[PDB]
């Protein structure tokens, strides 16, 4: 099937009655209204384009506003697209609610992780630090050697070095969905999903099932 | 089987076949004499 787009609001824990405390992440999966249906005619593939939340009336530009008010929806924050595996139809303008995960058992969550910025190789690539005493000179957390000698004569591409860590799209796979609360539009998953509290999460049914 | 640079007929009922560009020997009586790649 398809996924839903929600907002991460914190982590909590559910105390079940037997004793086991399940640490859950709360995803407020709001109503996703379909904006565009891409089909084989115009696009050569089938997919739906959804939106969630609502932007201010004047922050929405004229091309976005015309795209939204072309078919029966009000403007939300950002457009997304799900690839419709062979035999599902979602009419344009349709609000898709959260009971799609009241069906399912496991979930993968896609988000942009928290950005650590320019991180060194010890944080980024788990490099082992050099010996922090015993004579070492200005070389404790430096990367070490980065290539062999005259025969390569060059650093191989894909060398692990210091650089931007975080702030990238990552997907956590096969999380147990603990509770689907339609009355407050809450989806609770077992485990840690990517991103800071407030970033948008794409929630799909688990494909490694 | 026995990989060699020389395949011979050790037994009597072993025959020399050529399959997929490889000369090899198959015996019908004793399976030790199955050998290859001569």
């Amino acid at each position: 099937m398809i996924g839903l787009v929600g907002k991460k609001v914190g982590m909590t824990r559910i105390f079940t009655e037997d004793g086991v405390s399940i640490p859950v992440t709360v995803i407020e999966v709001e109503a996703n209204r379909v904006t565009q249906v891409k089909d084989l005619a115009n696009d050569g593939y089938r997919a739906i384009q959804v939106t969630t939340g609502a932007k201010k009336a004047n922050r929405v530009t004229k091309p976005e506003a015309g795209h939204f008010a072309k078919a029966g929806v009000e403007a939300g924050r950002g457009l997304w697209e799900f690839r419709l595996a062979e035999g599902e139809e979602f009419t344009v303008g349709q609000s898709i609610s959260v009971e799609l995960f009241a069906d399912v058992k496991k979930v993968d969550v896609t988000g942009t992780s928290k950005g650590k910025g320019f991180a060194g190789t010890v944080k980024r690539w788990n490099f082992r630090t050099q010996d922090a005493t015993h004579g070492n000179s200005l070389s404790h957390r430096v990367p070490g050697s980065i290539g062999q000698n005259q025969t390569p004569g060059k650093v191989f591409k894909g060398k692990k070095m210091a650089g931007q860590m975080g702030n990238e799209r990552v997907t956590v796979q096969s999380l147990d969905v603990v509770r689907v609360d339609a009355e407050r539009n809450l989806l609770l998953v077992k485990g840690a999903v990517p991103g800071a509290t407030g970033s948008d999460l794409i929630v799909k049914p688990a494909v490694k099932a | 089987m026995k990989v060699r640079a020389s395949v011979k007929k050790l037994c009597r009922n072993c025959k020399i076949v050529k399959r997929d560009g490889v000369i090899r020997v198959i015996c019908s009586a004793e399976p030790k004499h199955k050998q290859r790649q001569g």
Partner: protein
């Protein structure tokens, strides 16, 4: 979190007062041992009439750890001092006839059920 070169107190009465862990058994490159974990020990201090003598190499199981154990609700049980029960090398049964101090409920499996039968608290 018992590693190699950790000095452990001894919970049973095989005779060892204080032993030292020399390898955390089970798995390659393994770092630590918890309460449900077998280690290899060697004996540094013994009692003069006891069964095991100082300088032997045998096996133990940890029963108390200052790092603790974490129960599934999130509660931790942090003992004061690391403690082990000495097992035989190939029999894997305790060499003691009694056990001092409390032990943990997450030790409860068959051989260590024979351990916790002698235990004054679980």
């Amino acid at each position: 979190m018992i590693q190699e070169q950790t000095m452990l107190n001894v919970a049973d009465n095989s005779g060892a007062r204080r032993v030292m862990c020399i390898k955390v058994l089970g798995g390659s490159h393994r770092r630590y041992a918890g309460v449900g974990d077998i280690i290899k020990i060697t004996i540094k201090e013994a009692i003069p009439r006891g069964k095991v003598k100082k300088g032997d190499v045998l096996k133990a199981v940890v029963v108390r750890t200052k790092k603790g154990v974490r129960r599934p609700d999130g509660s931790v049980i942090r003992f004061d001092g690391n403690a082990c029960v000495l097992l035989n090398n190939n029999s894997e049964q305790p060499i003691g006839t009694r056990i001092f101090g409390p032990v943990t409920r997450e030790l409860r499996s068959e051989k260590f059920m024979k351990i916790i039968s002698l235990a004054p608290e679980v």
